[PDB]
Amino acid sequence: FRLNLSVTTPYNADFDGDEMNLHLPQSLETRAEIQELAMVPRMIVTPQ
Protein backbone atom coordinates (compact mmCIF):
# COMPACT_ATOMS: atom_id res chain seq x y z
CA PHE A 1 0.00 0.00 0.00
CA ARG A 2 1.41 3.38 -0.99
CA LEU A 3 0.20 6.69 0.36
CA ASN A 4 1.26 10.33 0.25
CA LEU A 5 3.27 11.36 3.26
CA SER A 6 1.08 14.28 4.32
CA VAL A 7 -1.48 11.76 5.60
CA THR A 8 1.03 9.87 7.71
CA THR A 9 0.21 12.17 10.63
CA PRO A 10 -3.54 11.44 11.05
CA TYR A 11 -2.78 7.73 10.86
CA ASN A 12 0.36 8.02 13.02
CA ALA A 13 1.91 5.80 10.36
CA ASP A 14 5.63 5.10 10.20
CA PHE A 15 6.68 3.21 7.01
CA ASP A 16 8.83 0.83 9.06
CA GLY A 17 6.70 -2.31 9.06
CA ASP A 18 3.32 -0.71 9.68
CA GLU A 19 0.35 -2.50 8.16
CA MET A 20 -2.93 -0.87 7.24
CA ASN A 21 -6.41 -2.15 6.47
CA LEU A 22 -8.44 -1.42 3.36
CA HIS A 23 -12.22 -1.83 3.21
CA LEU A 24 -14.07 -1.76 -0.09
CA PRO A 25 -17.61 -0.33 0.05
CA GLN A 26 -19.94 -2.55 -1.94
CA SER A 27 -22.90 -0.32 -2.88
CA LEU A 28 -23.55 2.98 -4.60
CA GLU A 29 -25.17 4.47 -1.50
CA THR A 30 -22.21 3.49 0.67
CA ARG A 31 -19.70 4.77 -1.87
CA ALA A 32 -21.52 8.10 -2.07
CA GLU A 33 -21.58 8.31 1.73
CA ILE A 34 -17.82 7.77 1.88
CA GLN A 35 -17.19 10.27 -0.90
CA GLU A 36 -19.36 12.95 0.69
CA LEU A 37 -18.32 12.52 4.33
CA ALA A 38 -14.98 10.77 4.82
CA MET A 39 -12.73 11.68 1.90
CA VAL A 40 -9.26 12.76 2.96
CA PRO A 41 -9.48 16.39 1.71
CA ARG A 42 -12.62 16.85 3.82
CA MET A 43 -10.79 15.92 7.05
CA ILE A 44 -7.97 18.47 6.93
CA VAL A 45 -9.31 20.51 9.86
CA THR A 46 -10.35 18.57 12.94
CA PRO A 47 -13.19 19.53 15.28
CA GLN A 48 -11.12 18.37 18.25
Partner 1 sequence: IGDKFASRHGQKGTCGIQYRQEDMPFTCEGITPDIIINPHAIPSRMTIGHLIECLQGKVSANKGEIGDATPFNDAVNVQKISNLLSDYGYHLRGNEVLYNGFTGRKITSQIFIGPTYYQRLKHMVDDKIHSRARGPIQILNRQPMEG
16 counts as binding Mg ion under rule CB under 5 A: yes
* Dihedral of alpha carbons 19, 39, 6, 44, sign: negative
Which listed range, 1-9, 12-20, 28-36, 40-48, lies at the site for Mg ion (CB under 5 A)?
12-20
14 counts as binding Mg ion under rule CB under 5 A: yes
* Dihedral of alpha carbons 40, 11, 8, 48, sign: positive
**Binding site: which residues?**
14, 16, 18
DSSP SS3 for 42: helix
User: Which x/- pattern over 2-21 shows residues binding partner 1 (rule: CB under 8 A)?
Assistant: -------------xxx-x--
